[PDB]
Design an enzyme around this catalytic site. Structure first.
Site: not given
Ligand SMILES: Nc1ncnc2c1ncn2[C@@H]1O[C@H](COP(=O)(O)OP(=O)(O)OP(=O)(O)O)[C@@H](O)[C@H]1O
Ligand SMILES: [Mg+2]
Lengths: 191, 334, 186, 65
Positions: A96, A120, A66, A171
């Site tokens: 996050m 990431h 987010g 990622d």
């Protein structure tokens, strides 16, 4: 969704099941991190400190990520308040969500055995339109955030900043065991 | 002759520490009570009415002790009544004339003496308003005509001809812990307002000291009963220093009571000054008033009291500061 | 969102209002600004002397809505302490800087951004209407820079430079600038 | 609780077989399964008050076993 109601024995008090778990010092972060969902976590963290500054707070995380600023409001609240905030990864802690997972009190960061933890570099913290001068400003702010997050991650994980810069380039998915070896969590729960 | 109000307080001083105004109010009313009773009752002489007292104070402040201490030297019939057992005339419970029956029994049913007596009604705050309020307002209403002069009709000294008792000259002292009364006084004295044009106002001992009928009415007493209790005397809440004096100064001080128990053995009990303050401080935090002093002393002495009757050769036991603050044994002197 | 209940039973925000904590979260709108005003008015009466804690996590919003908060903060007797959580951008940064001098706080990783206003309303219609709205926007721009400069103890010329384009600041930079007084850690 | 306050400490009860009984010298042991008290909490009056007993009754039961 219909949130079940449960009865606490004391007389009796009827709670929704999340208010009942807050009474046990369990705070949930479920789904995306938004200003509203982050401020509820902050409100709960502040409230629990007042109830008992010494007892641990259990912060259960099942979140894809987010907003960075919203996540930072949680992060600074976790670090500010006196009681240790233990963090537990359920399902996933990505972006996050992984940051806040790693932000738990060292030695009290947990993950469930089949949870998925992903770290990431940040994406857009906001669009980059307007003039090249505006785009330069927003690109610079995003790079500062990128460095801040890698620096805080490296601190959480007891790793070099250079390691987080490599590993957050794309990622980076980790099992609970890989997250433990990396330094994002301390223990993996089974029973 | 009569004792002066100062002599009454001097006698109260041997039992109650602090509450100088409550002791003064009681002493003056009792002195005036005596004077009224020796006043001529016929001719051009003015008829004298009476001023009743309401004692407002926190738990463990000494209300009942004042009444009991006062009673030791009253020389008139005196009774301790209890409002929690009163109900309306048509209901289970005691009627208000039961009080007169008790006062009358204290003087062997000599009515002339009963009519000159003093009644303390405990738990008056428990019959407040806040259908038929049988044990609440109904009692306040029933008491209106008992406190103001009526003729009570009470059973005889035998089994259930009834006795007519004129209550005109019976002095009534009522009291209780009006626990919810501070919030009312704060609401009246710190009203203020909300919003721009309006102006907003700044925000136990101080509040009770400024109590007015408006507060007692909002609390739950009826105006007709408040006006019959013209004198409102207040007791403060005991602080850390008052609670130290209560351990050693009174005639029946808490420490003296335990020294007597240890004195039924051959062991002298001594408290250090550090302990007395530590006890008073811990007791203050319990919010039970002076009563909290007993819990602390019972606590710290439990294990030495257990051993004491079996121990041989012990001469003196010393309760130091550490024995109150920490789980330490008292020093044993053999 | 489900707002937890804490123990009378409060929702957790009403419970924090009882502690004189007012939240401004998300965009500043007429409705969210009027709730802040209602809470500020309510708290002044509950106790005119005690501080009010105004927690800000906001990207900005309407200027007129933010000004209703701003004037309420300055009007009411109790000091309004301001704390930046997450971010205080645009009118959020303005309201942050508007806190009582010496009581403006930010958390260590918060982000504070100041900038000239954008459209306060569209500029359509005729060139005469566009002229009027352009003039009103410039007056607002000057008013905001002037009040910012006052808050920060800086020259108006400094705020005019620094608000030309989005100016992002760390909590330390905001402290050095004069937007906040202290940075909290523990 | 309020009715008991004046029974636990000294009062003269009117007792049918009326008999005047001075309860000053009666020892009272009061108790119960205060399960909600472990949740509130080494019991202290603060816990008993939050449980739901009135300070006036707590102060009359000085010893907690
Ligand atoms: N001011 C005081 N001076 C000396 N002893 C006091 C004082 N206040 C309370 N005490 C002590 O507290 C104990 C009980 O006090 P008391 O019976 O007056 O309380 P109370 O007025 O009945 O309280 P409540 O209104 O809650 O019933 C006694 O042992 C008494 O010595
Ligand atoms: Mg009493």
């Amino acid at each position: 969704y219909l949130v079940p109601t449960v009865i606490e024995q004391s007389g009796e008090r009827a709670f929704d099941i999340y208010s009942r778990l807050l009474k046990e010092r369990i705070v949930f972060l479920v789904g995306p991190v938004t200003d509203e969902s982050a401020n509820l976590v902050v409100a709960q963290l502040l409230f629990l400190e007042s109830e008992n500054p010494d007892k641990d707070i259990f912060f259960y995380i099942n979140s894809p990520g987010g907003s960075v600023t919203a996540g930072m409001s949680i992060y600074d609240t976790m670090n500010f308040i006196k009681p240790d905030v233990s963090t537990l990864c359920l399902g996933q802690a990505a972006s996050m969500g992984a940051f806040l997972l790693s932000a738990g009190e060292k030695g009290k960061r947990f993950a469930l055995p089949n949870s998925r933890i992903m770290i990431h570099q940040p994406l857009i913290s906001g669009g980059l339109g307007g003039q090249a001068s505006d785009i330069e400003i927003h690109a610079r702010e995003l790079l500062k955030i990128k460095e801040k997050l890698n620096r805080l991650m490296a601190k959480h994980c007891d790793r070099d900043l250079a390691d987080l810069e490599r590993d957050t380039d794309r990622d980076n998915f980790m099992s609970a065991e890989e997250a433990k070896e990396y330094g994002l969590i301390d223990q993996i729960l089974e029973n | 002759k009569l004792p002066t109000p100062a002599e009454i307080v001097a006698n109260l001083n041997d039992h109650v520490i602090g509450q100088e105004q409550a002791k003064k109010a009681l002493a003056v009313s009792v002195y005036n009570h005596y004077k009224r009773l020796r006043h001529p009752k016929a001719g051009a002489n003015v008829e004298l009415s009476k001023s009743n007292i309401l004692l407002i104070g926190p738990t463990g402040s000494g209300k009942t002790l004042l009444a009991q201490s006062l009673a030791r030297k009253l020389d008139v019939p005196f009774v301790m009544a209890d409002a929690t057992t009163l109900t309306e005339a048509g209901y289970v419970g005691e009627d208000v004339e039961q009080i007169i029956t008790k006062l009358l029994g204290k003087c062997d049913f000599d009515v002339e003496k009963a009519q000159r007596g003093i009644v303390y009604i405990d738990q008056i705050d428990k019959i407040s308003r806040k259908t038929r309020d049988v044990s609440g307002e109904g009692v306040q209403q029933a008491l209106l005509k008992l406190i103001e002069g009526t003729v009570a009709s009470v059973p005889p000294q035998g089994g259930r001809e009834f006795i007519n008792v004129d209550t005109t000259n019976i002095l009534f002292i009522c009291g209780g812990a009006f626990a919810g009364l501070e919030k009312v006084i704060r609401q009246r004295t710190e009203k203020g307002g909300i919003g721009f044009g309006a102006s907003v106002h700044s925000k136990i001992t101080k509040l009770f000291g400024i109590v007015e009928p408006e507060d007692l009415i909002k609390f739950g007493l009826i105006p007709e009963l408040i006006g019959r209790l013209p004198v409102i005397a207040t007791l403060e809440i005991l602080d850390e220093d008052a609670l130290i004096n209560i351990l050693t100064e009174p005639k029946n001080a808490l420490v003296k009571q335990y020294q007597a128990l240890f004195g039924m053995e051959n062991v002298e009990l001594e408290f250090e000054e550090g302990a007395l303050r530590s006890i008073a401080r811990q007791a203050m935090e319990r919010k039970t008033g002076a009563r909290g002093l007993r819990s602390i002393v019972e606590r710290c002495l439990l294990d030495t009291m257990y051993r004491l009757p079996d121990l041989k050769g012990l001469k003196k036991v010393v309760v130091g500061k550490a024995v109150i603050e920490e789980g330490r044994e008292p020093e044993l002197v053999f």
